[model samples]
Target: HHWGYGKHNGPEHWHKDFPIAKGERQSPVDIDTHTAKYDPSLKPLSVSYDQATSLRILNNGHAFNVEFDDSQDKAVLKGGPLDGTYRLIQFHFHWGSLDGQGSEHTVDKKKYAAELHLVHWNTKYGDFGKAVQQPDGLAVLGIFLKVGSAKPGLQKVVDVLDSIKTKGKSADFTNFDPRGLLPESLDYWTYPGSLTTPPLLECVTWIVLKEPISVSSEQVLKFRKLNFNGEGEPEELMVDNWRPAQPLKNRQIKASFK
Candidate 1:
């Protein structure tokens, strides 16, 4: 069977094909703020993005992704649990059918309306493909999206969802600056973890922001218009495309702030 968020093919059944799904250091863990230790050595994250780096947006049958031109260091992430520069490759969101639950990582068990993942790969490794296999190869900036007033930053993406409403459909989306989607504060919790999706590679250095960006309920309704099925197959609205939180195991969650 294929991997998906459906009852039969979802997270619980993933370990059959991807054994690493049950491995240590899995992502989207429950971040207990009370238990997180403050790390004085963790430097503030630095993100530099060129507006022109955004290329297009696609409905990849799972979640929609806004890919970037990562050929150069045009958009890069530094500091905050990273040793070297990590080039931004793509970014995506995970949300629920309802406003009550969505985010992958929960703060003290509090779930947000959605979660945005800004995926980057270490330049020390050759590319995303090669970097994804190493221990210190990827850094994902996780920003939670709460249900609030309509955010102009996210409205830019919502406005174009109609063109790519089905799986495998794509549209050119250029000159978009993803940094606008970030919250006011960059304070975060850092931990070593694996990808939240299939392949479940344990190559990510997770930097989950403490603050959440706001998005209106109406804007989120537009995201639900996209389909998980292709243009021909039976249509299923794309929602709840989030993996549940995994076990913390033996890892320590580090806070960038006290």
Candidate 2:
């Protein structure tokens, strides 16, 4: 079955195929900062990337993703609620049709223009597919994007969107270090959660930075230029690709800073 951000196959309809979509520890919860407790034991986040690890960028009919070479630990995320190192496999963005609202994870019901997810898998799990089935196998680094001055690092990604404007389209996007896109502060709110998208696997340890990176409205518009519909299909602009916030049940959000 085809799942997408539409009236028929949107987040509300995902549970029909992906039953775990409604399960406990679902992600993109409205982080009530007021209720999040400070975890003094939580270590600062550590993320290192090698320029050569970036492979290419592609439109996967759901969202445009920048794939990476994870055969080794050249690009990895460690510390920050994670017990072991996790290899960065890919990164993607979720945005809205308009700039006011788009981010999947909200802060006190506040939405940003977009959200970036750096997808990584635990090395102990052997591979990405196997890791998704384990409780502590994946650690997703989530960073919100607000409208502000043009971000030079982001501009590099936006520059190539025109080449991969349709689903399944990809272009070589090498030598780009994702590290440059991160915010100044590594302070974050973390929790045990699931993938916001289907199969909505409940395997992710979410590290959502408290600070957001800036992007110009024009850059966000470039994202909308992408087509969710593949070539030869009804061309539909890809916008509002984010999942709505899920319920926070029987879980607590921990902040790294007080």
Candidate 3:
């Protein structure tokens, strides 16, 4: 069975093929800020992205991912609620047909225009494949996107989307720094969660940022142009790619700021 954003295979029906979709540590949980506990011990995040390792961008029939050559520790994340250095593998976005209902994680049940996930694997795990099933082996940095001024750094990404307009399509996208996409504040809410997609591994130590970066309405429109079907097929826009928020279970979300 194929996994997609349709009524038959959408998130609510994912359990048929991937059992972990119902797991307790599932991601995209509703983030209620008022109840988030402030943890004084959480350290300031340390992130370094080396443009030299920024490989390319691809449309993997799922989302557009900007991959990094994680063979070295050049682009790494540390200091914030992590046990070891995590190497950046790739980053992607989850957006919608319209700006109103795209983001996966919500604040007081409010959805943002979109969400960006910079996925990293812990160095202890050796590789991303091995890290998928281990607890604390993956650390995803989540950033919410809102509509306002045009984002200065995103245009470069938009410029390349036309080249990889179909499934399995990719193009060289070098020297781009992923860190330029983050907000000014390093403060975030930390918790355990699974991948929002199939396999849904419960391995991520999620660090969801408190602030959102602004994007222009025109910029948001560019993503809607992406299609689920490639050339020589019925064109279906790849929108509303976000999964609905799951239950919080018994977990507690810790805030790095008050």
Candidate 4:
């Protein structure tokens, strides 16, 4: 019942255990800008992060995640397709061996070098596990990353990569604000979807930003240095750990900007 981005247990095989993988609102869909409708009613995104709430970073086999103290409203996301306050719990990224085939979500069928997801859950639901069971439970902020110059803020996170090169490895990463990784424009296209990983819960309200952030080739290579396996297991380089674009059944992507 194990799942991974491998030939034996990849996304294609996930449906065997996680039936929700075949659900209608699966995530990482190819966003067709031409078909994306502009909704003037969509509120401007509001992100507020309390640096002190930052805790630790971990390489959880699937992806490298930075977890925050979500006990309170220290790091919360509101507005932009969300009705109530959504507390940010963690953030992670997905990438590939090569720059052209990494990102889960595509721009008109074109994949970016990688994709970043800031995972948050609704406060009204009491907890993440409960919220993940409801349609409006989670709101994930999807940001595309392209090959270019190194991002200053991202570099800070990347700097700690060496300490977490293997699965289960983690290090204290405090005083770092997640908002520093955002792009200039918060304009985004949002749609109802599921988590791109195993147990593919259909509770995510995907808010994919219109603009992309740039990262140097050196930084991307560092991400490749991470291994999906732990110390006792055979070393498996963590590349292409992204889900493929799923079908966009009867959904309309709403844009925050005109």
Worst 10 residues of 1 by lDDT: 46-55
What candidate 1 gets wrong by more than 4 Å, as runs, is none
Clashes of each: 0, 0, 1, 1
Instruction: State the lDDT of candidate 4 residue by residue for 107-138, as single tens digits.
Output: 99999999999999999999999998899999
Show pairs that collide, candidate 1.
none
Question: Cα lDDT for residue 31, model 1?
Answer: 96
Candidate 1 per-residue C-alpha lDDT over 165-223 given as tens digits, one digit per residue, 9 for 90 to 100: 99899999998988789889999999999999999999999999998989999999998
User: Candidate 4: where is the Cα deviation over 4 Å?
Assistant: 50-52
By lDDT, the candidates rank as: 1, 2, 4, 3
RMSD (CA, Å), each prediction: 0.8, 0.9, 0.9, 1.1
lDDT of candidates 1 onward, in order: 0.93, 0.92, 0.91, 0.91
Clashes in model 4: which pairs?
A: 96-240
Q: Worst 10-residue stretch by lDDT in candidate 2? A: 44-53
Clashing pairs in 3: 96-240
Total clashes in model 3, counting residue pairs 3 or more apart in sequence or in different chains: 1
- Any residue pairs clashing in model 2, and if so which? none
Stronger candidate by TM-score (3 vs 4): 3
Error of 1 at 163 (Å): 0.8
lDDT (Cα) of model 4: 0.91
